[PDB]
Nucleic acid binder design. Structure first.
Lengths: 417, 555
DNA sequence: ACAGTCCCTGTTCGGGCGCCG
DNA sequence: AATCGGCGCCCGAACAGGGACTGTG
């Protein structure tokens, strides 16, 4: 099998990203994995004359004890050449199952002139030894170009199964295969096992999970049900008595919401506060203000019109920490033109680990963006950079890694929950 | 001893570059005679070859005394070749720390003699390492040489030697999986649990293994007996300490001297608990004149006295036990300063440290405590590969009310409370609901972009008003100045309504210290109050007193 | 829309300490 | 001091980046 020539995009060098410290638990898993990969010729040792590096770490698989090596190929993917219809019904299916088929890439060799850019360094506890560096000889998991080079082989493997089951939607994104159907949950999981055995005739799938029936909060990114995803509307308070403070909060909330909803009006409401009154003073709503409020309630209840996805523009996701384990998020491409607004609650680290929560929320939001639009959004994380970099790898279980940045947000997002 | 038969590392120049053509500067006769003796020796030994006029490159050469040794070190100013040499990925990711060493029955420390001069250099790259040794008589032309081995001062030499040493140790390390070999540059900490007799047998097998690869372990540099001098530490069998620290004693100090004092005090803080350098580093602000003399402030001298006081007594650390839990305890020493100790058994510290970084213009003790917990977490992963259990001077309910009310995601791993004052507290708390029977203050401020003059005032529901004129200010400062006015001219319970997200986000984060003098004045008022409710309204929307005060300050 | 100013964060570099060649 | 290389840490400061506010018709 001859290799496909791969180039970097014009005027860009390879990645040069330092390796971050890893726990003994993770180093022992990586060393075991890589020693076996070198034996089967999938990777090979290199030296410091290769000036490129990409961070590596290990994750524990979904409902399993085995480890998966994850490379942070984000920088290489930005710099890799681009190669050459998204199923709108996949988000309409009842059940959708995510299969890690990344192991198939290790059977296709990589262009020799390109392997230098896939270099990574395994660290050692207490810096006992220098870093041991490897590069890839085969298509690597997590690389943008692996699914494209393997695309021809993937359609060939799936074509018999897709004609035997034409009612099943099969989408591919990086290492993961998204399998959607409208069957019942039990008959659906059997069809997934049918696909797993069909793949075994060609390429090996992740070892099955310890559970055959959905265990509590262990199949979060595995068995997802898109037809039950709900959008979070913007709501206004319902009070019998309103104070000056209550009306000020309302006007400020409505005035901000007027950037997303055109028909929002605040004129008759601000008239009620025309004096210089005390915050606790009760203000009776006039007939004009009650109608304007009731009309704003209607506008916020109807969905927004004329907001469509642009495949050329990046997706952006913002998350707000609302407290009590609840997180609100919005996915958009242009400011105030949201493609989706959702809410997440009851996540692991129940009532205790904020970072484990945010890391899980980022994965489900990303999962939703892959299912709906086939892209991954750039995240604006409400967390300190060092707080996140210290702990996020401990709760990650996805095969992809979205781009993110960190922001210090003013606590006036009280407009979503 | 022949040059190592290990294969050279392919080295290239940067694309479209040539070699260095730097002329040799004059040298003193003491260094010339030392360079000649050295060069004729390492030509016979093969490390160096003579070159002719075909080689058009050159690089200046000098020779400094070896660190605590009578031998001369041959150094070359390859600053021009390093700019033209390809980039490398350095494999040395950190420095080994004694606190991460486990207990072993037998310990040996080795040292490779003439380390870089044992590893050969890529044949194609040798032409660019040309240098000239100027003779005593200026009529004689002088002998030009090139390098056959890794030169000292070339940017690729450390990485290539490190990579080469690992390949040489790999067969021996695989043949003996139970022997621990800490490899840093050319110094080898070898540790095993065998008996002292069988251990010396394996050390000789290791020394012979390195000798076959052209790496001599001289007897003068072969340590077989505790205490061990390793990486600037003293490795006693059951304790470890830092080699003697010498703090300079001077009547007048300069920037350079303070910079040295700061560094050595940092280097001592890994095992000496309580080192403070905030006031000594404060003297480094603004002055870039390196030989300028700085008078020691009262706080700096007091701080130096404290450091010298705890430095006269020797402190030792313990080694690591993988079976026992890792524990870290933090204390708040000064303002913005923290110290911590990592141990397994109480009063037997593995290592100590300090965190004193000011993150942000405005912060509180709870933020800094969480920043120090993060720094310790990372440090523990590097040394021991695991996260320690924490003992923090903060109440369980104090932290619970902070992380539930803060808008950012903040977390601290498993920790327990210790009642070691001074404790970490929230000095004030903003009310969640407007206070009944509290005067409501509508504040705002404005400023001119060119004139830099501005106003700041308030209006109340009791009819009380105020407007203060300000000079050399900004929009952000006047809205902060307006809130300061409302806090000044009110009782112990006040409701404040601002239109400034900037001012609101600062106050809502509950800072207790700030780089801004104005914010610190606001903080002092907020701790004095009993109930404060801060509200936000959109500007220019005809709302309440916000409209009244906007016209007052915009005029 | 578009361009400034203000303020804040994060990155890099200057000095220092330490290891070693 | 002139006069080198690689790594880690600290602390102080220059430079860049981004978001909010304000001023223009």
């Amino acid at each position: 099998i001859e290799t496909v020539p791969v180039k970097l995009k014009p005027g860009m060098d390879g990645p040069k990203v330092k390796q971050w410290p890893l726990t003994e638990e993770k180093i022992k898993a990586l060393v075991e994995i890589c020693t076996e990969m070198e034996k089967e010729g999938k990777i090979s040792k290199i030296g410091p004359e290769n000036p490129y590096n990409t961070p590596v770490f290990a994750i524990k698989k979904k409902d399993s004890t085995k480890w998966r090596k994850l490379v942070d190929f984000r920088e290489l993917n930005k710099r890799t050449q681009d190669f050459w219809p998204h199923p709108a019904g996949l988000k309409k299916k009842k059940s959708v199952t995510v299969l890690d088929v990344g192991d198939a890439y290790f059977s296709v060799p990589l262009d020799e002139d390109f392997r230098k850019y896939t270099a990574f360094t395994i660290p050692s506890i207490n810096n006992e030894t220098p870093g041991i560096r490897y590069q890839y000889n085969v298509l690597p998991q997590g690389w943008k170009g692996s699914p494209a080079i393997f695309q021809s082989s993937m359609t060939k493997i799936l074509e018999p199964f897709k004609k035997q089951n034409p009612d099943i939607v099969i989408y591919q994104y990086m290492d993961d295969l998204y399998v959607g159907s409208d069957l019942e949950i039990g008959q659906h999981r059997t069809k997934i096992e049918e696909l797993r055995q069909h793949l075994l005739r060609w390429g090996l799938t992740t070892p099955d999970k310890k559970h055959q029936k959905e265990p509590p909060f262990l199949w979060m990114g595995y068995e997802l049900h898109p037809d039950k995803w709900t959008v979070q509307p913007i709501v206004l308070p319902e009070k019998d008595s309103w104070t000056v403070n209550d009306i000020q909060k309302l006007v400020g909330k409505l005035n901000w919401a007027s950037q997303i909803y055109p028909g929002i009006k605040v004129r008759q409401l601000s008239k009620l506060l025309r004096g210089t009154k005390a915050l606790t003073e009760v203000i009776p709503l006039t007939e004009e203000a009650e109608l304007e409020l009731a009309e704003n309630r209607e506008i916020l209840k109807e969905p927004v019109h004329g907001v469509y996805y642009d495949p050329s523009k990046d997706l952006i996701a913002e998350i707000q920490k609302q407290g009590q384990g609840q997180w609100t998020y919005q996915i958009y491409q242009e400011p105030f033109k949201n493609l989706k607004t959702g809410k997440y609650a009851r996540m692991r680290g129940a009532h205790t680990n904020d970072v484990k929560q945010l890391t899980e929320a980022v994965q489900k939001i990303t999962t939703e963006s892959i299912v709906i639009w086939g892209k991954t959004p750039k995240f604006k994380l409400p967390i300190q950079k060092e707080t996140w970099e210290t702990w996020w790898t401990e709760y990650w279980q996805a095969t992809w890694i979205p781009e993110w940045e960190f922001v210090n947000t003013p606590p006036l997002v009280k407009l979503w929950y | 001893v022949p040059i190592s038969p290990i294969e050279t590392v392919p080295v290239k120049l940067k694309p479209g570059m040539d070699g260095p053509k730097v002329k040799q500067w004059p040298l003193t006769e003491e260094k010339i005679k030392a360079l000649v003796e050295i060069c004729t020796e390492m030509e016979k030994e093969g490390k160096i070859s003579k070159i002719g006029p075909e080689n058009p490159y050159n690089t200046p050469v000098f020779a400094c005394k070896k660190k605590d040794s009578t031998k001369w070190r041959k150094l070359v100013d390859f600053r021009e070749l390093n700019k033209r040499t390809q980039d490398f990925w350095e494999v040395q990711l950190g420095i080994p720390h004694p606190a991460g060493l486990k207990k072993k029955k037998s310990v040996t420390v080795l040292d490779v003699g003439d380390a870089y001069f044992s590893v050969p250099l890529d044949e194609d790259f040798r032409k660019y390492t040309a240098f000239t040794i100027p003779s005593i008589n200026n009529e004689t032309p002088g002998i030009r040489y090139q390098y056959n081995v890794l030169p000292q001062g070339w940017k690729g030499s450390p990485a290539i030697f490190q990579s080469s040493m690992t390949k040489i140790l790999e067969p021996f390390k695989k043949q003996n999986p139970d022997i621990v070999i800490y490899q840093y540059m050319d110094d080898l900490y070898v540790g095993s649990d065998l008996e002292i007799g069988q251990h010396r047998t394996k050390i000789e097998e290791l020394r012979q293994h390195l000798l076959r690869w052209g790496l001599t372990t001289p007897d003068k540099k072969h340590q077989k007996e505790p205490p061990f001098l390793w990486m600037g530490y003293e490795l006693h069998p059951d304790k470890w300490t830092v080699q003697p620290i010498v703090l300079p004693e001077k009547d007048s100090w300069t920037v350079n001297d303070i910079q040295k004092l700061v560094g050595k005090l940092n280097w001592a803080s890994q095992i000496y608990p309580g080192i403070k350098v905030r006031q000594l580093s404060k003297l480094l602000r603004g002055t870039k004149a390196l030989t300028e003399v700085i008078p020691l402030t009262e706080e700096a001298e007091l701080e130096l006295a404290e450091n010298r006081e705890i430095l006269k007594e020797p402190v030792h650390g313990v080694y690591y036990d993988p079976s026992k839990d890792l524990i870290a305890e933090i204390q708040k020493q000064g303002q913005g300063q923290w110290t911590y100790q990592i141990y397994q058994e109480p009063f037997k510290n593995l290592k100590t440290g300090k965190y004193a970084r000011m993150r942000g213009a405005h912060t509180n003790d709870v933020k800094q405590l969480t920043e120090a917990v993060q720094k310790i977490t990372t440090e523990s992963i590097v040394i021991w590969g695991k996260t320690p259990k924490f003992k923090l001077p903060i109440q369980k309910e104090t932290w619970e009310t902070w992380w539930t009310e803060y808008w950012q995601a903040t977390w601290i791993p498993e920790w327990e409370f210790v009642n070691t004052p001074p404790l970490v507290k929230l000095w004030y708390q903003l009310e969640k609901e407007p206070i009944v029977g509290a005067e409501t203050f509508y504040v705002d401020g404005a400023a001119n972009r060119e004139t830099k003059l501005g106003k700041a005032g308030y209006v109340t529901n009791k009819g009380r008003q105020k407007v203060v004129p300000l000079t050399n200010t900004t929009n952000q400062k006047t809205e902060l100045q307006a809130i300061y006015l409302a806090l000044q001219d009110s009782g112990l319970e006040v409701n404040i309504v601002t239109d400034s997200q900037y001012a609101l986000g600062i106050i809502q984060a509950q800072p207790d210290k700030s780089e801004s003098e104005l914010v610190n004045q606001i903080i002092e008022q907020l701790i004095k109050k009993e109930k404060v409710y801060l509200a936000w309204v959109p500007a220019h929307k005809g709302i309440g007193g916000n409209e009244q005060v906007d016209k007052l300050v915009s005029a």
